[PDB]
C-alpha cells in the first residue's frame, strides 16, 4: 500500500511540476528556460542559462527508496559544494 501510494503521489508531483514549468515558459520566462526531456514518472529535465543568451535539472521517481533519500539531480554540471545554497 505504501509503495503504490508513494509511486502515485510522486508521479502526480512530477506532473504538477511539469505543468508549472510549461506555465512559466508560456507567460513569464519565454524561452529563457526550456524542457529538455520529460519522462512521465521517470524524470523531467529543465534547462536554464541557454547557450543563445547545456545545464539540466532532472526530477525523478525511483520505484521505492529506503537506503537512500530520493532528492533531485542536477545532472550535467554537478554543482560545486556550497553548504548554504546546495541545501536549498
Amino acid at each position: 500500500m505504501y509503495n503504490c501510494l508513494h509511486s502515485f503521489c510522486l508521479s502526480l508531483q512530477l506532473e504538477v511540476l511539469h505543468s508549472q514549468t510549461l506555465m512559466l515558459i508560456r507567460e513569464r520566462w519565454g524561452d529563457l528556460v526550456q524542457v529538455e526531456r520529460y519522462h512521465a514518472g521517470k524524470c523531467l529535465s529543465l534547462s536554464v542559462w541557454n547557450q543563445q543568451v547545456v545545464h539540466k535539472v532532472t526530477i525523478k521517481i525511483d520505484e521505492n527508496d529506503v537506503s537512500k533519500p530520493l532528492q533531485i539531480f542536477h545532472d550535467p554540471p554537478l554543482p560545486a559544494s556550497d553548504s548554504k545554497l546546495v541545501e536549498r
Partner: protein
C-alpha cells in the same frame, strides 16, 4: 370535477398575481453599470477591459443567477488584490457592485503584474531584476532596493507609484482604442495621425523614432523611482547642511 379544475386555475392565477404584485429592476440596474449579453439561459457579462483595448487572454464572464439576484464571479478572481510597491534602503453600493468591482480590480492587478514580470524577464535592461513568484526586485541605485509585489489576499508602501502603475497601464490600453488612429479623410486608410503627417510634413529619423518608441512599464516605473530617491537624497542633504 369542475370544482377541482376551477380551484387549480384560481390558485395558479392568484399565485401569478402574488408574484406580480424586483428581479427585473435589479437586472436592469446591473446592465447600465456592467455590460451584459444573452447566451442560452445563463446570461453573462463582461468583466474585462477588452473593450478598452487590453490584450489579455482571459474570459471575464461573470454569471447572473436568480438568487433578488446574485452575481457569480469567475474562479480565481475572488478575494481582494492590491499591488504593493515599496522602497527599502538595503541592497450605498449594491451587494453585487462590490463583488464585481473587487473582481475587476483583481483582474487589472493581474494584468499589471503580468506586464511587469514579462518586461523584467525578457527585456534586456541595465541592472537586471529578479522575479521569483509574485515579487520583482530591482536595484536602481547601488544602495537602493525597489520591490514590486502583487499581494493577493484571496479571502513603507509608496502609493504614488501604485497609482501611476494603474494610470500607465490605462494609457497603454487607451493607445490602442485611440481616436488618433481614425483617418478624417474618408479615402485615407488608417493608423496614427503624426505617422500620416510624417509623409508630407517631412520628418527626420529622430521624430520618426520618437513617435514609435519601444519602452516598458518596468523601465518607466524604475526611472520614476530613481528620480524620487534622488529628490529625497538632495532634500535630506540640504536639510543636514
Amino acid at each position: 370535477s369542475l370544482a377541482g379544475a376551477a380551484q387549480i386555475l384560481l390558485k395558479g392565477a392568484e399565485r401569478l398575481t402574488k408574484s406580480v404584485t424586483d428581479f427585473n429592476s435589479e437586472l436592469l440596474r446591473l446592465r447600465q453599470h456592467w455590460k451584459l449579453r444573452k447566451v442560452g439561459d445563463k446570461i453573462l457579462g463582461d468583466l474585462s477591459y477588452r473593450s478598452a483595448g487590453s490584450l489579455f487572454p482571459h474570459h471575464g464572464t461573470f454569471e447572473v443567477i436568480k438568487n433578488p439576484l446574485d452575481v457569480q464571479i469567475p474562479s480565481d478572481l475572488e478575494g481582494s488584490a492590491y499591488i504593493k510597491v515599496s522602497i527599502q534602503k538595503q541592497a450605498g453600493s449594491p451587494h453585487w457592485q462590490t463583488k464585481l468591482e473587487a473582481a475587476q480590480n483583481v483582474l487589472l492587478c493581474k494584468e499589471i503584474f503580468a506586464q511587469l514580470s514579462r518586461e523584467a524577464v525578457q527585456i534586456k535592461s541595465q541592472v537586471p531584476h529578479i522575479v521569483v513568484k509574485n515579487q520583482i526586485i530591482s536595484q536602481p541605485f547601488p544602495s537602493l532596493q525597489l520591490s514590486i509585489s502583487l499581494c493577493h489576499s484571496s479571502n513603507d508602501h509608496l502609493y504614488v507609484l501604485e497609482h501611476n502603475l494603474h494610470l500607465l497601464i490605462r494609457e497603454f490600453h487607451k493607445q490602442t482604442l485611440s481616436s488618433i488612429m481614425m483617418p478624417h479623410p474618408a479615402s485615407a486608410p488608417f493608423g496614427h495621425k503624426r505617422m500620416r503627417l510624417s509623409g508630407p510634413q517631412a520628418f527626420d529619423k529622430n521624430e520618426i523614432n520618437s513617435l514609435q518608441s519601444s519602452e516598458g512599464l518596468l523601465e518607466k516605473i524604475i526611472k520614476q523611482a530613481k528620480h524620487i530617491f534622488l529628490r529625497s537624497r538632495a532634500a535630506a542633504t540640504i536639510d543636514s547642511l
